[PDB]
Amino acid sequence: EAMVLVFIVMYLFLHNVRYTLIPAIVAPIALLGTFTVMLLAGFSINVLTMFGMVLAIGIIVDDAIVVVENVERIMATEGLSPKDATSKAMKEITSPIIG
């Protein structure tokens, strides 16, 4: 349920589905990698870990959302080519994302 809500509002802001797709795919892969790390560490599937994952659902997509918003806005305003525009937007937004 959380995921769909996390999805829903994003589209409501992006007003275009294809933009909203990119943030969505990030979460399932991150959760699957978290499951792999739990397997390696030996952690079990507890209500505590699942609640932490529910809390994470929102945080996980923030990194993708920032870059998506930056690329969309810069493309809409400047109007440059999608590929060069997205490479540039990645150049600007690297430090805030990593921090």
Added chain:
Amino acid sequence: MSQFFIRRPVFAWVIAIFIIIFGLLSIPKLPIARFPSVAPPQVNISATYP
């Protein structure tokens, strides 16, 4: 630069496929329980003096 995977989508795609596959494989083997072993361990000693 952090542009290597931007240059070629295939590498990022295969990395994502590996992460997805390994997680799908991992989920079945994980133990399931309501709560972890948070409680303090207890050891009991029994002596009988009839």
Added chain:
Amino acid sequence: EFAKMLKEEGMSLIEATVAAAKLRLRPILMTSLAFTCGVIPLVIATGAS
């Protein structure tokens, strides 16, 4: 971050900060409301948990 960078390019600190806030208002809302959406399922709960 963007306020400090705009200072680096030489923009006036106050005018730098206001413009930075105007530009970065969107993503802040986008990541705050996304987290709030994630937490809404928990706050409005009718189950045994």
Added chain:
Amino acid sequence: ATILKPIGFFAWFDRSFDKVTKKYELMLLKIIKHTVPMMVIFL
């Protein structure tokens, strides 16, 4: 990069966001006029 292709309710949303950012700039300047009261309120 791969998925993106060059290019009512959504228009209403966009214009609402534009109005929000305009009011945000005005309100931010107004707050900047009053700094010490904001600091005291933060405390």
